[PDB]
Each structure stands twice: as structure tokens, then as C-alpha cells.
């Protein structure tokens, strides 16, 4: 009786192009595929069969993409490979049956699906609130500084394309909807960098401005990483830049609150 590397379950995400269900025989004794037969079952159906003797791989029309790597079979690797589109529609308890000459075995692996669309909950709740707090704050400096047209001209549009950017981004599972949403966001914050240095200098402006630029191109070259492919493990840079730009804006609001008061 064959034994396995017992595996409870596996999780796949929207960005898992190719899906792999593990099946490892620990005590395989075969010396040619002729001796071997593998049957993959799902929900009481035979969804993949490899006959070693004829090396005939046979699959239903509903799993046309399914395969195992023959090469690795004799080593104990009877793991199943399928494309994303087939897997998504078929989440459940997969069964692997492997048969030699005089010994057989089977094992069960549950296929689970989870959605964490593009960024992790905490990450995609940051890069939305920092460049909303930021402009909300700019409005305070604009309102206090008024009581240019230009600044208010380019002021409404910034709030609009953050409100647009930050609802284009956050739906779905890593679209070009999101990709563009976030781009509109970083470019909005990227004309905010200009609309914050549109006051008029102290020794306090050249600071907040230069560090705002630093953190900004850190946040753009901090996004040039991320825009490419789902599950980008390059989030902290994008959040930190927008952090310093939020905070620079914060120095902005209150240092001017000091001026417009004290001669």
C-alpha cells in the first residue's frame, strides 16, 4: 500500500496563472511508466488519466488544460497542473489515485480559492487615505490663504481625479482599472507637489518641498515596481512616499496658520 506526503489543502489567487495540486508518493518502486497508472478524480468524476503502458493522457472537455509531468512520475511526483480558468470553476476535494504492479494508493487534497485583490487590505486602505488627507489639507491652506483662480482651477480637478483615481482603484482583482486608478492617484499627488509650492521663501519651505519631492519620486519609482504584475511585494515605498507627502502638506497647513496671524 502506497504512502504520500500528506497535504491538507492549497490556496490559489487571481494571479496564479498555472495551478498545481501536489501528490507525492514516498515509497514508489516502479522502474518504468509502463508499470504505472494515475487517475485524478474531482467530485466523483475521472478528470485526468495517465496510462503508463500506452502513455495516453486523457481528460474531459471540462479540464482540457490538465496535465502531470510524466518526467517526474517515477520519482513519486504525480502532481496535477491546470490553467487558472479551469481551476477557478472547480474548487473542491481532488483525489489522486496512483497504481503500480502490486501496490496502489490514493490521497485527497482540497483546492481552496481566496481573493486579496491586488494589494492586501491594509496596503490599499493606506495609499487611498494619505493622498486624500493630503489634498483635504491643501484645501485648508487654499481656504485660509484665499480668506489666484489658477490654484482653485487646478484645485477642483485634483480632488476630482483623486475621487476618480481612488474609485477606479479598489474594485476588482488587479485590473488596468486599478493600475490606472493608482496612476491617476500618484499623478494627482504629482501635481499636488506643484500646487503646494504655489503659495508666495522661508528656510521652512525649501525643506518641506525638497523632502516632498524626494518622497514623491520615491513614491513614483516606488510604483514603477508595483504596476507590473499582481501580488507586488513592493508596497511600503508607495505608502511611505505618500506618507511624507501627506505630512509635508501637514507642515504646510499649520506653518501658514502661524503666518496668517502673526504679521
Amino acid at each position, epitope marked *: 500500500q502506497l504512502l504520500f506526503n500528506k497535504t491538507k489543502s492549497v490556496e490559489f489567487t487571481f494571479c496564479n496563472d498555472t495551478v498545481v495540486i501536489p501528490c507525492f508518493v514516498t515509497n514508489m*518502486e516502479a522502474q518504468n511508466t509502463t*508499470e*504505472v497508472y494515475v487517475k485524478w478524480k474531482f467530485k466523483g468524476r475521472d478528470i485526468y488519466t495517465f*496510462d503508463g503502458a500506452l502513455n495516453k493522457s486523457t481528460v474531459p472537455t471540462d479540464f482540457s488544460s490538465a496535465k502531470i509531468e510524466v518526467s517526474q512520475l517515477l520519482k513519486g511526483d504525480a502532481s496535477l497542473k491546470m490553467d487558472k480558468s479551469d481551476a477557478v470553476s472547480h474548487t473542491g476535494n481532488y483525489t489522486c489515485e496512483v*497504481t503500480e*504492479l*502490486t501496490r*496502489e494508493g490514493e490521497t485527497i487534497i482540497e483546492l481552496k480559492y481566496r481573493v486579496v485583490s491586488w494589494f492586501s487590505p491594509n496596503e490599499n486602505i493606506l495609499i487611498v487615505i494619505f493622498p486624500i488627507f493630503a489634498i483635504l489639507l491643501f484645501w485648508g491652506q487654499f481656504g485660509i490663504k484665499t480668506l489666484t483662480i489658477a490654484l482653485l482651477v487646478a484645485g477642483l480637478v485634483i480632488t476630482v481625479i483623486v475621487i476618480v483615481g481612488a474609485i477606479l482603484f479598489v474594485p476588482g482583482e488587479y485590473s488596468l482599472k486599478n493600475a490606472t486608478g493608482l496612476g491617476l492617484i500618484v499623478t494627482s499627488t504629482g501635481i499636488l507637489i506643484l500646487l503646494h509650492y504655489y503659495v508666495f521663501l522661508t528656510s521652512f519651505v525649501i525643506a518641506i518641498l525638497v523632502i516632498q519631492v524626494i518622497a514623491y519620486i520615491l513614491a513614483v519609482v516606488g510604483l514603477s515596481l508595483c504596476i507590473a504584475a499582481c501580488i507586488p511585494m513592493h508596497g511600503p515605498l508607495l505608502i511611505s512616499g505618500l506618507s511624507i507627502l501627506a505630512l509635508a502638506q501637514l507642515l504646510g497647513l499649520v506653518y501658514m496658520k502661524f503666518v496668517a496671524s502673526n504679521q
Partner: antibody
Amino acid sequence: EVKLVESGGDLVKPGGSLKLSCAASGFTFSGYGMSWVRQTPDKRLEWVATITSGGTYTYYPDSVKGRFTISRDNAKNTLYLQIDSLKSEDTAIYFCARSLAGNAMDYWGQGTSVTVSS
Amino acid sequence: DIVMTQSPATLSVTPGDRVSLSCRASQTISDYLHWYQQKSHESPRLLIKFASQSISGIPSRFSGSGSGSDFTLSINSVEPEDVGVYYCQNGHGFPRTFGGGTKLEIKR
């Protein structure tokens, strides 16, 4: 096609020993698992032995109390079965057979006759 | 030490007739069940493997069915050449047990 040829069957005294040879022809001998199956004169069929393609691993039923020893000379295209401590109960026809998974035997030989009498 | 039981023991059929031979296992063996025939003065030849899979050069009239415990070898339009003995053999469980055998006599 494929052709399998057993020889070495004979009359033997009880307790004696016989070595059976099986000549394989018309396929990659060293590519396939092989087996021994006997057929009692009551015309029932009993699997007695099985060897992997590589000759490394062997398999037997508990029925024949470890008296049978299978081997294969992959160079000479010859499968062998050593039957020892023969009993009256071993009198049968011995078939070699090419074995697939689930020990599906898709080629059988013509048979060789073992008889064990006093 | 699984037990394979075939049924019937013996059988007389008129050529051009359909016939069902049964095979029963003493435990679940999925679709891992093989069928051979033996014409007297010949050795066994494989008809079916894995319950249902037909072999190269087997007449189109044999096919196997069933799964789990109960199995059926069907001969749709038997011929006077098909006179012989039919054996089922379990592909799963230990050991590789054969069935008792079904003798098929032809009527004329």
C-alpha cells in the same frame, strides 16, 4: 509481434527444485514488468510472482510461503522463476506474462508443465 | 486476501446472441478490473483492462462495464470462435486474484 516462451517444466520428486526460463522477443524486455502465473489442473489461475522492469523489486502472494524466487537477465532477454521445496500442490502449467499497471498481463506464453509426483 | 467470484459457472449461448458475464469482488476496487479469455489448447489473452478499456486487436463485440464491486463482460453477438473460459482479475487489492472462471459453451 510479441512472443513469450517458457521452458524447464518437468516431472520432479516432491521436495525437489526446478528453474523455469522465459524467453522474451518483440519488445523492449527491460522496459516492462513481468509476472509468473500458474494454472492448476482444476483450470483455476493463480498469480505466483511479479518483478519490476529493473529487476530491483519483486512481489509474491503469501500462498507459496516464499518458495518461488523470480529474476530477470535484461541482457539475454530472459525472465526466470526458481521454484524450490516443490509440493504436490504445485503441479500446474506455468505462464510468464508481460505486466502493465494493476498487473494487467497483456501477453502470455504458451505454458510449461510442472508435475510433482512420488 | 480479497475473493473474486464469477457468475455464471457455465453457460450455453446461440451464436449471434448477446451474453453478460458477472464478476464480484469482496471489496471496492474502483474500475481496476481486467478480463481475459482462454480457448482450450491456448493460453489466456487480455480482452479488457481497467473495467472498460478495450485492447488492440480484440473484436469490437467485447466490452467491459461496472465499477466498485460488481462488473460485467458483455459479448454483443457471440461467435462459435468465442467458445472458451473467461476470467476476471482484480487490479486493486492484494493479491492479484483471478476469478473462478466462466465456461462459455456454444449451442448449435
